[PDB]
Amino acid sequence: SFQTQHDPRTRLGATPLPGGAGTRFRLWTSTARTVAVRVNGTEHVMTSLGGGIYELELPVGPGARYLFVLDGVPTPDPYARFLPDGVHGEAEVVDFGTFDWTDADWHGIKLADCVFYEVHVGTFTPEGTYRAAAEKLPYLKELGVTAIQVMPLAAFDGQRGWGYDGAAFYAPYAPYGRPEDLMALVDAAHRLGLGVFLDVVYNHFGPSGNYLSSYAPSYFTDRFSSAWGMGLDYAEPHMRRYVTGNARMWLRDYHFDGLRLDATPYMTDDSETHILTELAQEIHELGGTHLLLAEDHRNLPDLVTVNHLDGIWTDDFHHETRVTLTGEQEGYYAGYRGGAEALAYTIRRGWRYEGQFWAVKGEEHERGHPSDALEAPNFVYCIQNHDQIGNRPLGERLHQSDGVTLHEYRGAAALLLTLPMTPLLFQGQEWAASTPFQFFSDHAGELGQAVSEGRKKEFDVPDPQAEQTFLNSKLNWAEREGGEHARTLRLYRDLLRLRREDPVLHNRQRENLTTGHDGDVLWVRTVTGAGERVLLWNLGQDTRAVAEVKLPFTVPRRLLLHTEGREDLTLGAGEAVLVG
Ligand SMILES: OC[C@H]1O[C@H](O[C@H]2O[C@H](CO)[C@@H](O)[C@H](O)[C@H]2O)[C@H](O)[C@@H](O)[C@@H]1O
Ligand SMILES: OC[C@H]1O[C@H](O[C@H]2O[C@H](CO)[C@@H](O)[C@H](O)[C@H]2O)[C@H](O)[C@@H](O)[C@@H]1O
Numbered sequence: 023s024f025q026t027q028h029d030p031r032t033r034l035g036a037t038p039l040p041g042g043a044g045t046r047f048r049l050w051t052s053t054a055r056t057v058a059v060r061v062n063g064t065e066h067v068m069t070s071l072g073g074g075i076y077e078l079e080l081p082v083g084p085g086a087r088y089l090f091v092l093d094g095v096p097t098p099d100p101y102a103r104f105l106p107d108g109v110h111g112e113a114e115v116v117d118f119g120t121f122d123w124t125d126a127d128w129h130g131i132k133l134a135d136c137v138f139y140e141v142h143v144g145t146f147t148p149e150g151t152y153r154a155a156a157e158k159l160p161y162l163k164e165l166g167v168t169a170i171q172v173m174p175l176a177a178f179d180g181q182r183g184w185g186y187d188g189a190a191f192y193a194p195y196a197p198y199g200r201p202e203d204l205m206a207l208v209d210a211a212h213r214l215g216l217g218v219f220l221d222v223v224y225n226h227f228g229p230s231g232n233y234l235s236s237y238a239p240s241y242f243t244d245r246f247s248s249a250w251g252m253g254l255d256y257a258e259p260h261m262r263r264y265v266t267g268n269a270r271m272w273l274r275d276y277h278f279d280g281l282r283l284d285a286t287p288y289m290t291d292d293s294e295t296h297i298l299t300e301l302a303q304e305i306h307e308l309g310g311t312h313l314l315l316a317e318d319h320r321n322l323p324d325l326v327t328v329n330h331l332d333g334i335w336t337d338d339f340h341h342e343t344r345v346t347l348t349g350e351q352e353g354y355y356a357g358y359r360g361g362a363e364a365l366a367y368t369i370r371r372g373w374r375y376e377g378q379f380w381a382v383k384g385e386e387h388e389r390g391h392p393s394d395a396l397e398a399p400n401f402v403y404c405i406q407n408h409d410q411i412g413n414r415p416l417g418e419r420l421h422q423s424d425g426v427t428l429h430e431y432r433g434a435a436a437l438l439l440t441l442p443m444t445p446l447l448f449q450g451q452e453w454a455a456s457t458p459f460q461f462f463s464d465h466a467g468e469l470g471q472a473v474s475e476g477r478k479k480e481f482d483v484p485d486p487q488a489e490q491t492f493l494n495s496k497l498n499w500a501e502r503e504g505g506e507h508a509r510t511l512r513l514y515r516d517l518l519r520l521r522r523e524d525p526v527l528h529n530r531q532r533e534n535l536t537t538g539h540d541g542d543v544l545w546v547r548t549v550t551g552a553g554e555r556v557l558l559w560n561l562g563q564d565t566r567a568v569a570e571v572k573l574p575f576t577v578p579r580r581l582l583l584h585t586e587g588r589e590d591l592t593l594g595a596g597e598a599v600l601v602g
């Protein structure tokens with residue numbers, strides 16, 4: 023009996039009318055005294071319906087250009103479906119009915135079947151567009167990933183950016199391509215049997231191009247703030263519907279299989295039904311198999327069990343892994359010892375912090391909750407993602423950090439890709455890419471200068487505003503064909519094939535997973551009705567024979583995969599083996 027709050031009849035923004043009758047324009051304003059739409063350069067006064075709702079139907083169709091005029095001020099449409107001249111410009115009318123989808127036989131992807139591959143459209147290819155990205159889909163299918171995780175596409179200011187400065191949430195960022203180019207990308211992925219997920223940012227708007235307050239200051243609250251402005255007021259139903267409307271667009275209109283909600287701890291809502299719960303209700307009302315994941319550092323199972331999200335990006339695994347390999351202790355890395363025993367524990371518990379004191383200076387509190395309710399697929403694990411690379415001063419990747427060997431990097435991949443938790447890989451990870459992933463932006467004027475200054479002060483640090491910082495983050499595809507890059511790629515392929523094919527590795531139950539250690543050797547054991555597998559990872563500096571590792575069970579004898587392709591059951595420093 024949940025009824026969506028959304029009706030195409032009353033949708034805010036510009037919506038094509040049936041019967042070729044044109045377009046219905048709608049907006050909500052709490053403060054404007056005069057309200058007009060400017061279409062293709064001509065102003066038309068809009069009809070006042072009450073409740074600050076304004077509407078007008080005109081015989082213009084898809085492709086018409088418009089913005090609204092509030093008390094005589096031309097103002098971009100926050101509900102714009104496309105912004106061909108960027109976030110300060112006219113919107114284009116978009117008709118979602120005209121694209122010829124060929125993915126009728128695609129029915130989404132279950133979380134337990136996902137191996138995510140995180141893509142930044144601007145850097146994934148030289149062109150930095152959906153059309154160029156689509157040409158890499160067969161490579162990704164053959165690689166063995168099953169779901170692309172696309173960084174945010176909401177329009178933001180400037181000619182490149184990560185996506186976290188999105189301001190017009192309904193408008194795919196024009197430099198990447200037109201709406202139909204995005205549809206072509208999703209349709210192509212589906213035809214290859216790959217899922218496509220989108221990163222969406224419902225905790226804040228970027229600093230440039232967000233005009234919602236021009237319509238109604240009450241979209242936002244002074245009670246709390248975001249990084250860029252006033253906090254998003256989830257007590258206000260129009261603010262709720264701005265994001266639930268947006269979620270439904272991406273899923274229904276662009277055929278995304280799921281969404282990754284950025285920084286859910288900062289979606290503040292004291293309503294009876296939390297906005298996260300209402301998001302789940304709204305997307306499920308679509309009657310598909312769409313998934314919602316949360317990026318959430320609180321180690322809070324209620325995200326799944328109460329808000330009915332599907333899973334959670336859980337960084338304790340990533341952090342424990344990095345500290346294991348580097349010994350670093352700056353910032354939140356101080357929360358972790360690292361090492362075989364620490365990793366065994368963190369895997370056993372899903373996440374490490376289940377209520378214990380987090381002693382990180384400046385952040386001290388009792389962090390997290392018991393993980394018992396969560397099942398293996400509910401945890402999303404990685405050893406690399408945009409933040410864990412990009413929030414480093416030089417944006418270097420794990421194998422590029424001081425004191426990490428390629429052998430260790432390959433061992434880390436084996437651990438990640440054999441665990442029943444849902445893995446995520448960052449673009450280029452699979453071939454040990456030579457290129458960093460640095461923080462880049464392209465804001466205008468004083469704001470641009472403030473970002474450059476901000477980055478310098480926070481930590482030579484590459485200037486985020488420099489074109490070179492963007493270009494230095496571009497993938498170099500040719501390099502994967504040779505040397506250590508090719509070796510790493512072969513291993514990733516072998517791991518992903520084993521994940522797919524191995525009947526024991528099909529396990530998705532924490533009940534069947536056990537872990538432990540002998541000195542600096544980590545072991546991870548899976549036992550199902552199909553058999554037994556053990557992953558051993560030598561995190562020490564010396565060589566260890568599998569036969570001499572003390573285990574509370576008899577080690578399986580058959581060598582299924584060795585991270586350095588060795589014939590015998592011996593582990594060099596940093597190496598791993600899967601036995602069965
Ligand atoms: O404060 C938020 C929630 O805390 C508890 O929920 C967590 O802790 C429980 C055991 O302490 C677990 O059973 C549960 O899976 C966790 O999410 C509390 O039980 C909830 O009602 C609170 O909302
Ligand atoms: O070598 C001095 C440091 O020893 C420990 O850290 C190392 O050993 C950990 C396993 O116990 C690894 O995770 C870590 O990468 C190593 O640096 C100790 O924890 C540190 O506090 C010492 O500085």
Ligand SMILES: OC[C@H]1O[C@@H](O)[C@H](O)[C@@H](O)[C@@H]1O
Pocket residue numbers: 319337338354382385
């Ligand atoms: O993983 C825990 C960390 O997550 C970060 O994203 C939080 O903002 C930071 O405060 C915390 O130390």
Ligand SMILES: OC[C@H]1O[C@H](O)[C@H](O)[C@@H](O)[C@@H]1O
Pocket residue numbers: 052073074240258259260
């Ligand atoms: O601005 C007048 C009213 O406009 C809309 O109804 C908002 O949903 C409501 O919260 C507000 O009180």
Ligand SMILES: [Mg+2]
Pocket residue numbers: 540541572
């Ligand atoms: Mg020992």
